[PDB]
Amino acid sequence: PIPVLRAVDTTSPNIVADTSTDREQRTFATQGGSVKPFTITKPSPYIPGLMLTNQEILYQAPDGKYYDFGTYNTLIMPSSSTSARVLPNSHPMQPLDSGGKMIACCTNQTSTGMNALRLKSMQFGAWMSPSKTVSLFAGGTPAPTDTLQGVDTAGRPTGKATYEVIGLRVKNDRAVTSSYETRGQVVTGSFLTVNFNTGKLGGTIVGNSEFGDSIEMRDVNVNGNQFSGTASSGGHTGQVSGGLFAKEERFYSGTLEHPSGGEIGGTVNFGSNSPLNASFGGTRREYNAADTSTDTSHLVSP
């Protein structure tokens, strides 16, 4: 049986909120809740008297309670038994001390492959209240605007980038996910492309019998590291709100290796307490700051 997750007591002197600018987080949530940084001190399991201090992120639910990301409040991992990797489309959520439930991306495990899940600078998921209302979220370290793609060669963002993503909804006490199967060959997957020349985002989060109807981006504008606009699913219009995540990557000398915005996430909101509401997150599969396209067609290098 899945264990009940207890809240973290952040009033402990060993758990200290991190107010540094470097660790500031941003969350998109449908009905409250956010990811928040802490410095946490814990006794060593191995060395007497030794205290171990590390940076952590906790999820603060809409009720104010804090939860860690751990082993039982994540998506089911795909099987490792063949080359094939299939993400199951339905997942149990972990019950909470409050009577709510929680789930977040299974970021942590190796040889899953499945690049959308390999998030390093964000998380996405959902919290359910004891009353069965849900707040879906995507939050993380925002992509600094000064190191977005193209800024180093033009002074502003330019070109295009394509992201490999997963969508999450909550249906009937379970988390349900968009179709994803890999074998960088992808049998089924969901892709979003940002055109920084035109400031547009396009793409489709692919549905199935569990997730429900696909979510098609319709008119989404991109301003700096944030975006917003409309999407459709089954005839219903939802409001898209999201952003680009992850700092830039540098070579040892300080030279830019990859721009900021290597991850992406957000929410799609079809109405207060709508079961269609979604969060999503994923990773940058490809980018080209020099692309002069004016459309949101995907980049498709092998």
Author numbering: 15 to 197, 204 to 322
Kindly provide excerpts from the paper associated with this entry:
The Neisseriaceae family of Gram-negative bacteria express a bipartite receptor, HpuAB, to efficiently use haem extracted from Hb:Hp complexes as an iron source. HpuA is expressed outside the cell, anchored to the outer membrane by its acylated amino terminus. Although a direct interaction between HpuA on meningococci and Hb was not detected using flow cytometry, the lipoprotein is required for the high-affinity interaction between HpuB and Hb, for meningococcal survival on Hb as a sole iron source and for efficient dissociation of Hb2023. To investigate the structure and function of HpuA we crystallized the carboxy-terminal portion of the protein from N. gonorrhoeae (NgHpuA-C) and a full-length homologue from K. denitrificans (KdHpuA).
